Ligand binder design. Structure first.
Ligand SMILES: Nc1nc2c(ncn2[C@@H]2O[C@H](COP(=O)(O)OP(=O)(O)OP(=O)(O)O)[C@@H](O)[C@H]2O)c(=O)[nH]1
Ligand SMILES: [Mg+2]
Lengths: 1068, 174, 326
DNA sequence: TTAGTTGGGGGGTGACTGTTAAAAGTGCATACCGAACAAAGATAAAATTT
DNA sequence: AAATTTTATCTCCAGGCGGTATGCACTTTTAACAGTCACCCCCCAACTAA
């Protein structure tokens, strides 16, 4: 075959030609850099051509032997790319991108030292010398001096390669010469324990006596307020749990399994529909559609990965390593779980982009912790630490949980760093577009095989508000109808949205604590912002111990659910519902030409309003029923000012009456000799009728209505229904049940009670203001001085307004006549509360209007004139009641206005030690992300270049300071209540405990208030502000004005704070 | 087309005119000289060429540029739109033809093995427009075995081909 | 800023234009903001009947004196035309009124849509808020609410040059084409009757007539063109598919079609409806690739009617009340 | 559904090696538009203009 | 620098408009002529694996 012979010869020739050309001068990764400098290029050439196996190590020595503002968005993205390539273990891609960016004149200016250091460390971990030398040539060509990390990479490479000590002693003698310290080498944050071990071995080979600095005994806080808490001398009775060790270990294992799963399934509490043919058909169709969507999503993800890799191969940045972080199945399941819970009305594009990226990070962190091998360390450490909180187990020396956790030997704790905001938004957008494009459904679901054309499940529709437009993703109506038809019995929650089943991990630093694996922010802010975290991490480590201990103490409180209240609530929800009590009604019990359109619009609005309340109630009730016979814990964290809030959103003690009724303590305490009285007083307080009478009269009234209490306890719904008339109906019923069980018992003193008792502070903000000013009249007004009957300002304001209104209506104007008996405490409470914080009359009117709207007996047609009248008269009554409070408010406002005028934001430090800062700035620019569907507009948080906003800084200063002083008091009260063995949980200004320990908790509160306010808070604030801001003499005159304002604090009055200890109604 | 050749040509570059000035003389200088060698000689001359000649050539280039821009401005006005639409359609056709040519050549350069030959083609080769008519008229074994050999031999050539494409990164070609 | 007319020859010309209607020329002429009353004086001299609606109380006593002994031809009412029928729901303060109350007080009776023009309204648009008053009237007209409940009310009011050009934009002039032009060209028949520069009119503020010569010289640089335009609601505006119940969907469709101007109709139809965009585009008689700026208003009406008339699909729109206030 | 295969012919153009300058491409930045309607009344600091 | 115009309106519990046009700065690409050789497409049949 002459033809075949010619073909073989030609193919052989072409193969040889291609091979030679590829070898000298296709998608091939680039290794050897292209050097600009003539001398450096010649040096690399002679280094490569000197030997077939070039002497890379001594050239590495010689390369560094001679030693001859905020980053841009693109640099931020490139740094994240290079750091992620290390985690993903894709080094050739990072090297290729680095050589490509170093090659061209314009993109060489982008690279900085950190990228070279990261690639150098990545090559060092594998012990590769040639690529390390290439990167060193690159960084020397760029005109940069190697830092400590560049020497660490070389030392790690030499240690891993086990090469001769000669280059090692040369390197260390230089490191001495240049001034670098070997001690600073082992404290670098950007290092792992394996790398430290390797560099330690390398150093030990040369210097045998090299010793790491010895460990130090843990420091102890020595502040004036916290000295008593951390004193090692005294008598202590720390509370212990009521469960054996094995039960706690089993619960810890269950919680670990739940968190590793990342999901939990809760059986829905809806009325189970009868399984007819229609439901079965709907469920079958749903299952088939879900399977098809899963396969389509898998294929789309693979195609996107291929495209992004090809884009990277051409020398441009993309999201390929970020996609490589997680397994395909996990991403597909996350995307299918997002679709399952999409509301019928729809969700915004930006919100979906934010949610999808946030879910990816948490699973990545959990997977990294699982793979690294810290799960076993945590499992070994917790099983020993749990001996402190067990009834049968014993500890050699009692101590706070954090102290025992540290003293037991703390496991090495490392956590991942957040991605840059542009990367987060781009990843979210990409995932959202993939989800939109992949899913498809048949056109006519109800009619079988009517047509075979396929329509998308999700649609992109613009929504117009005023001039502005917003993109919205909305489901197909047929899919929503199918979902309603199916009526599946399962609900799905995220792991971090469900109360923990095991004691919370102790807070040990601003980076650890709360959930065992998932990351929790110490301060809840927006993703971009980082100023608060920086201020927290730049302070002495021992300053934050009080806050961490208070949060840990609040975290470790066992809870439980109430059976009878939950049963009654479920009965109303499953049936037609009771809207008056608070149980939302089913949509079925709905009201259901221009007149017809108006009627339809009203009915639609009513249905839309009902449908959200029912869904929220459904979620809460399903969660409550899932935890029927279990003990659960709720972790806590602060906002940017100090106030403490629980982490789980749905079910916690900060919600409405139903949520607070469904919860009770898991530890029983005998009522003692003074418990039944406190239970009855709590019942009367919950009723709300006797809100202005001494304790004796409240107890007497509780005795008087005993028949109604015992009737409502025995037959809740079929009786006289006396409990329905209370201000809080559901909590009143639970208190009635507890009181009935107590009295019917043989010995009421021996009855154990699991019901918390609330103690509230009256006019807390005005109380703090009066304490700061030490005013006598103000303190006497807000119950800061001994008295026999409670006193409140809000009732006096209503009396004065009523007097003026009666005199006005005597002259006969219509609006004053209409409001005959609608001047109550509730309508004028929040205005007089917030006048001292700086409320405007435009603001005061929108509060009084909102209050008058919901009265339902006042004619709902005169609101516009009634609000305008009520706020003029309230301000006509409030001109001369508060003097020292207004003086302090004026001083604070003036100081913040002038500080904000100089170009810096306001900062202060809480008396405990937590630093605070106000993040109000004018938003100059917003970024955009172009894409296939639409351009997402998102705010860039953390831009410190913009100027401060004087209006917001001046208005927000008076409230935040008082709120910080409010949370410092609770944390002092909680810390000193722990030592006496009490159980303490709090709701901002209301403190809860068992029925027996209310007297002790009251004593502790009254003592710690005086201890907190004995210190000169105002003078310390003035000194701190003077030192922080007026120190710079750059602008002499403005700084002089600022110092004159700052060095003029209001003078105190004449009021001894010791009388607070003898006030009965300071907290009641 | 008619409009294609009607479109004026741009002024020729200064170095090109410099080359054209001494190209005939260099052709007579060495008959054995080739195009590449002559071009490299002219490049060397431009390396040693003075700058006054460059300036006068640049002035002439400006003169020709004004002439050409005025002429093309005149020409672009008087044309009818239909021939313009035909010209634009045919220029994008030419661009697509160029892209297809480049793709075909890149495929040939990347060691493309021969496709299975047909028996009717082997018969044409054995028999040896008229030729096509004769072989078609005659149309109305060994090649099959060779095609069977081609199937057995070229299939593992595809299998052999993949590893280089993996090594050279051309995964998308698969 | 109010811009009441004062000139006498202009008043005569405007009176002649207003009363030039052939059939029963003296319609009941509701006049918005007559102010000094030279225009109403000319109208009354020409034999017409005028009811004055003042937002300003001060002109009320003055105008009554002009109307004294005029045989009930002049009826002063303290009302604002653009504040008719507030949508807030409280007690109606004197500066606003109610369409039903005013029309019962004047004795005007409701007239069916297919019948002839019942009334005529003259005046001037708000100086700065023309956009807002064109939208309010359009919602009132499409829903058959407010004054348009009583038939087909004629509106002849001066409008500015820029808004006149924006309102009369066409597919031939795409840079100004938008939603308001489409809806107003579909709803009514707009014609131009007179033209007048700003210099002829005089501006009265709260302080009084503009006595500033420097501002007058500055106003000389602020000249524009005021067009007197006449709107007549179209008899066949409402059809079986386009009814006062379905105007929200059409409005949303029009606002969506101009959200991304440089896009084919298929791209918007894919988002708006689950049906086949190709079939609808073929039915209405358009090519596959058609830009929205090249679409006449009647083509938009035909598209909406074609989508609504489809009976095979149980779900024909994705717009819902949820997309409002979100 | 279609690009790829073999024969004798023919045709157009790719490479080459060369500088030059105009034309296209790419990333960033700012400015203007939509003024989806929907009563009214209040007060003083931020904001722009002459 | 004073005046007039415009704007936000106590705080916390984690929120942000989208599209089109024009401009600037720098890199990348393309056509200008040379002559000779090489390569691919026709020219029309014939057909075949992607
Ligand atoms: N600035 C501001 N602070 C509030 C607001 N609502 C509550 N607070 C703070 O929360 C504290 C407690 O508020 P509440 O328990 O609701 O009411 P109160 O002021 O304590 O008065 P009582 O209801 O009698 O206990 C107050 O001292 C305020 O400082 C508010 O709307 N604005
Ligand atoms: Mg309180």
């Amino acid at each position: 075959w002459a033809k075949i012979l010619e073909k073989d010869k030609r193919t052989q020739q072409m193969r040889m030609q291609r091979l030679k050309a590829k070898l000298q001068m296709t998608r091939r990764l680039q290794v050897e850099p292209r050097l600009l400098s003539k001398q450096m290029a010649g040096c690399l050439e002679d280094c490569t051509r000197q030997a077939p196996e070039s002497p890379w190590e001594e050239q590495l020595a010689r390369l560094l032997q001679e030693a001859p503002a905020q980053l841009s968005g693109q640099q931020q993205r490139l740094l994240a790319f290079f750091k992620c390539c290390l985690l993903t273990d894709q080094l050739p891609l990072a090297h290729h991108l680095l050589v490509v960016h170093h090659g061209q004149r314009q993109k060489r200016k982008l690279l900085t030292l950190d990228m070279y250091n990261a690639v150098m460390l990545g090559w060092a971990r594998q012990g590769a010398f040639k690529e390390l030398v290439y990167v060193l040539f690159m960084v020397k060509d760029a005109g940069l001096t190697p830092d400590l990390l560049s020497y660490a990479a070389a030392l790690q490479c030499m240690g891993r390669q086990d090469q001769d000590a000669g280059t090692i002693e040369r390197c260390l003698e230089q490191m001495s010469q240049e001034g670098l310290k070997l001690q600073a080498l082992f404290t670098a944050v950007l290092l792992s324990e394996e790398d430290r071990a390797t560099v330690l071995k390398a150093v030990h080979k040369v210097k045998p006596t090299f010793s790491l600095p010895p460990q130090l005994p843990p420091p102890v806080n020595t502040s004036k307020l916290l000295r008593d808490v951390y004193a090692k001398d005294g008598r202590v009775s720390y509370p212990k749990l009521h469960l054996p060790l094995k039960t706690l270990q089993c619960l810890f294992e269950k919680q670990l399994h739940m968190e590793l799963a990342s999901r939990v399934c809760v059986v829905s509490v809806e009325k189970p529909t009868l399984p007819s043919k229609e439901v079965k058909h709907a469920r079958k169709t749903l299952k088939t559609l879900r399977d098809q969507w899963e396969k389509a999503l898998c294929r789309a993800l693979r195609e996107t990965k291929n495209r992004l890799e090809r884009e990277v191969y051409e020398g441009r940045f993309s999201l390929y390593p970020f996609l490589c972080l997680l397994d395909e199945r996990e991403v597909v399941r996350m995307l299918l779980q997002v679709l399952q819970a999409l509301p019928a009305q729809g969700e915004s594009f930006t919100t979906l982009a934010r949610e999808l990226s946030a879910r990816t990070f948490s699973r990545h962190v959990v997977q990294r912790q699982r793979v690294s091998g810290q799960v076993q360390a945590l499992q070994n450490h917790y099983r020993k630490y749990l001996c402190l909180l067990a009834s049968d187990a014993e500890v050699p020396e009692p101590c706070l949980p954090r102290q025992y956790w540290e003293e037991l030997g703390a496991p090495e704790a490392l956590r991942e760093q957040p991605w840059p905001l542009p990367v987060q938004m781009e990843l979210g957008k990409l995932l959202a577009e993939m989800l939109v494009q992949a899913t498809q459904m048949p056109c006519s679901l109800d009619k079988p095989h009517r047509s075979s054309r396929l329509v998308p499940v999700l649609y992109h529709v613009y929504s117009f508000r005023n001039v502005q437009q917003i993109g919205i993703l909305k489901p197909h109506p047929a899919y929503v109808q199918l979902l309603e038809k199916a009526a599946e019995p399962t609900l799905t929650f995220e792991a971090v949205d469900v109360p923990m089943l095991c004691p919370p991990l102790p807070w040990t630093s601003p980076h650890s604590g709360a959930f065992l694996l998932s990351p929790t922010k110490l301060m809840r802010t927006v993703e971009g912002a980082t100023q608060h975290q920086e201020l927290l991490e730049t302070c002495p480590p021992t300053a934050l111990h009080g806050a961490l201990d208070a949060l840990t103490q609040l975290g470790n409180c066992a809870w439980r659910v109430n059976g009878r209240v939950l049963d009654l609530v479920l009965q109303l929800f499953q049936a037609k519902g009771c809207p008056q009590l608070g149980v939302p009604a089913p949509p079925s019990e709905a009201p259901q030409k221009a007149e017809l359109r108006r009627e339809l619009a009203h009915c639609q609005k009513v249905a839309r309003e009902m449908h959200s309340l029912r869904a929220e109630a459904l979620y809460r009730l399903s969660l409550a029923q899932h935890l029927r016979d279990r003990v659960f814990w709720l972790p806590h964290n602060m906002d940017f000012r100090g106030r403490t809030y629980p982490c789980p959103p749905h079910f916690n003690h900060l919600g409405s009456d139903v949520a607070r009724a469904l919860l009770e303590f898991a530890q029983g305490r005998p009522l003692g000799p003074h418990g039944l009285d406190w239970l009855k007083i709590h019942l009367v307080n919950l009723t709300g009728l006797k809100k202005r009478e001494p304790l004796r009269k409240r107890l007497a009234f509780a005795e008087e209505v005993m028949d109604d209490i015992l009737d409502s306890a025995d037959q809740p719904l079929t009786g006289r229904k006396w409990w329905m008339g209370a201000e809080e109906p559901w909590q009143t019923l639970a208190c009635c049940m507890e009181v009935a069980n107590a009295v019917r018992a043989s010995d009421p003193a021996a009855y154990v009670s699991h019901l918390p008792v609330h103690q509230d502070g009256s006019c807390n903000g005005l109380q703090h203001y009066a304490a700061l000013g030490r005013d006598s009249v103000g303190a006497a007004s807000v119950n800061l001085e001994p008295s026999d009957v409670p006193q409140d300002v809000y009732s006096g304001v209503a009396a004065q307004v009523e007097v003026f209104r009666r005199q006005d209506a005597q002259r006969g104007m219509r609006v004053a006549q209409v409001l005959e008996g609608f001047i109550t405490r509730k309508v004028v409470k929040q205005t007089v509360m917030t006048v001292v914080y700086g409320v405007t009359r435009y603001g005061g009117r929108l509060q009084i209007e909102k209050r008058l709207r919901e009265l339902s007996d006042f004619p709902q047609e005169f609101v516009w004139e009634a609000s305008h009248y009520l706020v003029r008269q309230v301000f006509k009554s409030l001109q001369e009641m508060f003097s020292g409070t207004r003086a302090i408010q004026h001083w604070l406002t003036e100081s913040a206005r002038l500080i904000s005028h100089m170009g810096s934001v306001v900062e202060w430090v809480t008396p405990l030690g937590v630093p605070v800062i106000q993040p109000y700035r004018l938003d100059s620019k917003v970024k955009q992300i172009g894409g296939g569907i639409q351009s997402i507009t998102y705010t860039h948080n953390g831009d410190i270049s913009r100027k401060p906003n004087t209006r917001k800084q001046k208005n927000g200063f008076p409230p935040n300071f008082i709120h910080s002083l409010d949370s410092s008091h609770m944390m002092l009260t909680a810390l000193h209540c722990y030592r006496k063995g009490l159980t303490f949980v709090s709701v901002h200004d209301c403190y809860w405990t068992h029925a027996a320990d209310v007297s002790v908790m009251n004593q502790v509160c009254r003592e710690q208030f005086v201890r907190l306010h004995s210190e000169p808070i105002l003078q310390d604030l003035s000194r701190f502000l003077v030192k922080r801001f007026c120190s710079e003499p750059q602008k002499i005159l403005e700084a002089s004005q600022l110092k004159e304002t700052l060095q003029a604090v209001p003078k105190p009055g004449a009021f001894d704070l010791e009388q607070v200890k003898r006030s009965t109604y300071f907290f009641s | 087309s008619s409009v294609l050749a009607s479109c004026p040509k741009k002024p020729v570059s200064s170095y090109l005119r410099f080359s054209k000035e001494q190209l005939p003389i260099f052709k007579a200088q060495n008959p054995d000289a080739k195009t590449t060698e002559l071009i490299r000689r002219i490049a060397q001359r431009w390396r040693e060429l003075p700058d006054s000649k460059k300036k006068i050539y640049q002035d002439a280039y400006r003169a020709e540029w004004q002439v050409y821009k005025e002429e093309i401005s005149r020409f672009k006005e008087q044309l009818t739109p239909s021939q313009i639409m035909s010209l634009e359609k045919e220029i994008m056709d030419k661009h697509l033809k160029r892209k297809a040519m480049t793709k075909k050549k890149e495929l040939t350069l990347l060691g493309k093995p021969k496709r299975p030959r047909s028996a009717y083609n082997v018969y044409v080769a054995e028999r040896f427009q008229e030729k096509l008519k004769t072989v078609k008229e005659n149309w109305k074994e060994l090649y099959i075995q060779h095609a069977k050999e081609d199937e057995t031999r070229y299939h593992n050539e595809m299998k052999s081909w993949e590893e280089q494409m993996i090594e050279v990164g051309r995964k998308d070609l698969l | 800023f109010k811009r009441y007319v004062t000139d006498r020859r202009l008043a005569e010309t405007l009176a002649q234009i207003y009363l030039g209607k052939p059939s029963r020329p003296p319609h009941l002429l509701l006049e918005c903001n007559p102010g000094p009353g030279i225009l109403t004086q000319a109208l009354l001299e020409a034999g017409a009947k005028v009811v004055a609606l003042e937002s300003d109380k001060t002109f009320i006593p003055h105008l009554e004196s002009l109307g004294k002994n005029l045989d009930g031809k002049l009826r002063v009412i303290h009302c604002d035309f653009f504040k008719l029928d507030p949508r807030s729901g409280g007690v109606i303060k004197p500066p606003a009124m109610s369409s039903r109350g005013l029309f019962k007080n004047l004795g005007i009776e409701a007239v069916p849509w297919t019948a002839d023009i019942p009334l005529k309204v003259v005046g001037m648009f708000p100086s700065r808020g023309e956009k807002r008053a064109l939208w309010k009237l359009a919602y009132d007209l499409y829903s058959c609410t407010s004054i348009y409940k009583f038939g087909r009310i004629e509106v002849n009011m001066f409008i500015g040059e820029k808004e006149f050009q924006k309102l009369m934009a066409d597919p031939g002039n795409p840079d100004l084409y938008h939603v308001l032009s489409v809806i107003w060209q579909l709803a009514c028949e707009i014609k131009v009757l007179h033209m007048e520069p700003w210099s002829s009119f005089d501006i009265y503020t709260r302080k009084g007539p503009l006595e500033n010569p420097k501002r007058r010289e500055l106003l000389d640089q602020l000249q524009q063109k005021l067009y007197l335009i006449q709107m007549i609601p179209r008899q066949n505006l409402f059809t079986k598919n386009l009814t006062p119940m379905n105007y929200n969907i059409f409005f949303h469709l029009l606002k969506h079609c101009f959200g991304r101007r440089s896009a084919t109709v298929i791209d918007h139809l894919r988002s708006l409806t689950p049906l086949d965009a190709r079939d609808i585009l073929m039915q209405i008689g358009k090519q596959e690739d058609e830009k929205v700026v090249n679409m006449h208003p009647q083509d938009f009406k035909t598209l909406f009617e074609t989508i609504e008339r489809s009976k095979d699909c149980a779900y024909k729109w994705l717009y819902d009340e949820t997309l409002e206030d979100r």
